[PDB]
Symmetry: D2
């Protein structure tokens, strides 16, 4: 059937590409040049936002729930009953539930579907998806997830965003702690390369030490794939998840504050892994 | 040639078993019944501590450098020139360098060779070894490491212990943060099983979420393989490493304090993963 | 002119008494018994909630903004233009700003006016008031604050609540840090009494070391004046203040988590200063 | 006749030795000797080469760290006479100071750690608080010579004074920084820092930091230089050593050392300790005033 994608960003562009190669796909983006470019590259069709309502399934991958609200309100007058809204934005659980209630007024079923895998996973089409919403709706949308591999239904609306936020909080902690430790080792003469060869074959290994630090930090490449400002935004959502019960969570709480320092020192558009540059700055040595 | 192993503990017993099946091996343990048991099971030879001096390579896997010192002093009169001392204890860099100096007076070459892989890695014989010491000595001992797989030379004496401490600090942080995050998700109705299925296929994954939490926490098994007290001891050594330059290290500094709380609440002989029981206690819910 | 006071708790009862001495005063309490008692003691007049709208100045001293909202909704149909609402509740800045906007629709000017000084200060009529609101409105209500001594205009609506929350957050940090410090000194043999004599005459002094620890901890008296659960609640409001700009605030964020630990270990009913009992438990020694 | 001597005429030492100079015949020495000469002209002390310091019955030192105390002790070692007292006002290390005490004992010299609190203003007023560590007999003998102090407390054996000083400064650090985080948040939402402090200083959250440092140095934008940020970090380092004794859970104090290290790395060790708040203003994009 016909699907539509809104938000052709670092993640949305490649994600919509997989959709375009499997289904008749309509695409829209605020900066429309991206939509025209996408049409030429993948066979999708660039359309005015209003036409997105023609789709059986509408996909969004925007910065925050705030922007998803914006596009939903713009489409509200045209939305048709029986339509599904798959939101791949790393959004806010509560605001998303309110959005789902609003969409139901038009017979549109909303599901939070944030993802993990980065731009490389998006390009490969192997993104892990954490779905939140009705089981019946989940079954209906699974076949349309052409850009994913592992798809997990984690609960009702909002549960997906909650799991994504916590996942990113763990990534943040793992990455920053590794930075602190490696900086200390490098300063006393240990090869960062050697330290990681050991760590990645030991109990302290994480996706951060295995697939981010060696490739982006040791190489000094620091490619831009996920804005530091967006990671801080996710950490903020994670704090919201922690506020539910407010059980003692000193480590994750501190994580939000340290990444905020990095954001203030390096800027929101720096890559998230560049947060380690702050440690290098204070340390007076590069993790190299 | 002859090798000898001192300290048949959770790690030492299986480690010495690999040596016993490759080389003529002598074994000794403070609680001697363990040595007699080892001899019966692996074909090693239980001997008085003094006879360990007959070995070309002496291995130790004790609690701390303090105990390595105790054993070394007891052996001083018997140590023979040309002997190698491979210390698999998760020891202190500085104290080990001092010990290496005094052993060098007897013609004994000390190498810090701490390991990672846990009791399961020790049983399989796939331990990762991080060696600190002279290049020539490293090449001489490699063939005797029958309980290892990945063996990395990370620097001079003490460097091995330094890397191990940092590796364990990363494990500690990764593990606790995961606990804080999963606790929050569980309290709002999300299955830890589901959350981990997502996380272990996402960017927040780590050895802690992949191989410790599902196996020990979700199952409620909490097997005893690595004492919480020893992990706190390792964290203490890591803080010594951070003290070298004293670059801002908020996350790792906090990690030592939270695990200390767990130790004081649960006892030093609880398994290190049981630290998460403190979070379950505060949260009033089990991580499942 | 006529005034009305809502909420005759440990703070409100004496506060309304000071008002009764100067102006015709109407009083209301969730439970009538207290209002009748007040009338019989001060000459105020106990009335049904509806009559409170007859006053020129309405005062509220309730548990939280939630209750202030409840009373506001009940009085809304009766509120008259040109009326002032002075809220002495330790409320939430944001929710209170929304309330002020709602009340403005009725020509009612809301001013947040939390107090410090406790029951002793309320009884003596020497409370310190931190006012948030328009300059002209502040000048208008100053002469009505019969229960106060120091009255300070700290900013726009919400600023009073914000200062109250931050103040208690600082009290929390100062008290806990002092505990960690004193615990270490006591463990190594230093007299808690002598340590405090020095500190209280030195740069590290605070109201906590000066008027709380020596009188309540060293003596083991631990009198109940401000519940630990209430301090945690105020710390929560403080985190909300922090959330406005989200500038790096590691110390204050950590403070909320450590007091939450105390609350979960000792219970909400324990006095706030008893939080140090948790440190005593871990340290294995009393701060005395 | 009996004389006293002071080594290290710094921010603290200069005025401290001034109080001694107007009270007893005092010999003074400073690495940068021009400082010693100026002191003689200003207080009536006698600037002399380091060797003459051993002529004193009581020798005072107020140097950066125990390290400098050590090298000055070695230089004087061959001249030290039995029966002399060494009053060390340096904010030093407990353990290193104990070894120094043993070493000095070889010459019949009695060491006492006597770190102080009160800042340069307290030093000038002669109202410093002193925390003594050492033998009761020695303490009683030195009390009458502490002309720059008001409150004097014997807290224990050698090293105990330095320990209490380190913890005191750790508390100051936490109090000052937390107030900064809180004030930064308040100013950002339209709250008057001046008025907020008036309330806080009349409430439970008050501390010496909010009462006598922030209003006078930050709100005014004056940021006078009286106590180097680098030295405060050094003190926090010593405080961490005190926490290492038992290693009971101490999250707040541990974190305090890390945040001030950040400030030191960003602003430099020679900035004033209170300038650490400039880092918060930097991140906040607003000044606390
Ligand atoms: N990058 C990564 O590695 C991962 C990111 N995510 C999450 O995916 C989401 C998007 O991230 P990413 O693709 O990197 O983001 P980018 O910044 O690359 O793209 C953001 C997209 O949102 C659009 N947008 C922004 N504001 C508006 C608006 N007001 N109205 C309409 N469209 C708007 C942009 O349009 P325009 O082109 O006009 O600017 C752009 O298409 C975020 O929630 C992020 O946290 C999840 C997993 C991984
Ligand atoms: N367990 C794990 O998962 C891992 C542990 N390590 C490190 O390995 C080292 C040992 O750990 P683990 O095997 O779990 O320890 P255990 O507590 O199981 O064993 C400790 C061993 O040291 C011996 N020992 C203790 N005190 C003395 C002494 N005074 N003189 C002589 N021998 C003594 C014990 O003898 P006895 O039988 O008489 O008590 C025992 O053989 C530690 O440094 C630990 O941090 C490293 C990686 C993994
Ligand atoms: N400032 C304050 O508010 C307080 C400081 N303290 C403690 O007092 C001690 C001194 O602080 P402060 O007075 O501010 O320090 P300053 O940096 O102002 O002065 C340090 C003094 O030590 C001397 N000095 C430095 N290195 C050497 C050396 N290698 N050999 C001989 N003399 C040396 C200096 O000599 P020169 O003139 O040649 O440079 C100077 O007289 C520190 O331990 C500090 O932590 C305690 C309470 C308060």
């Amino acid at each position: 059937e016909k699907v539509a994608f809104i938000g052709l960003g670092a993640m949305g562009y490649p994600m919509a590409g997989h959709l375009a190669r499997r289904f008749p796909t309509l695409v829209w983006n605020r900066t429309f040049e991206k939509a025209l470019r996408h049409q030429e590259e993948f066979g999708s069709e660039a359309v005015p936002l209003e036409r997105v309502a023609e789709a059986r399934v509408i996909f969004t991958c925007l910065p925050t729930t705030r922007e998803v609200y914006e596009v939903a309100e713009a489409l509200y007058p045209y939305l048709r009953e029986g339509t599904y809204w798959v939101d791949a934005t790393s959004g806010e659980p509560e605001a998303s539930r309110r959005l789902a209630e609003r969409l139901r007024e038009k017979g549109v079923t909303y599901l939070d579907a944030p993802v993990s895998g980065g731009t490389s996973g998006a390009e490969a089409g192997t993104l892990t998806v954490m779905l939140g919403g009705p089981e019946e709706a989940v079954e209906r949308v699974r076949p349309f997830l052409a850009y994913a591999k592992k798809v997990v239904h984690v609960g009702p609306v909002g549960a997906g965003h909650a799991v994504k936020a916590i996942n990113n909080a763990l990534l943040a902690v793992n990455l920053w702690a590794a930075g602190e430790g490696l900086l200390a080792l490098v300063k006393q003469g240990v090869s960062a390369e050697k330290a990681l060869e050991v760590i990645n074959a030991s109990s302290g290994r994480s996706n951060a030490t295995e697939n981010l630090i060696p490739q982006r930090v040791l190489t000094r490449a620091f490619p831009k794939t996920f804005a530091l400002g967006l990671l801080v935004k996710d950490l903020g959502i994670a704090m919201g998840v922690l506020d539910g019960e407010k059980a003692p969570s000193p480590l994750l709480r501190l994580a939000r504050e340290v990444y905020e320092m990095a954001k203030r020192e390096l800027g929101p558009d720096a890559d998230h892994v560049e947060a380690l540059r702050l440690l290098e700055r204070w340390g007076g040595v590069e993790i190299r």
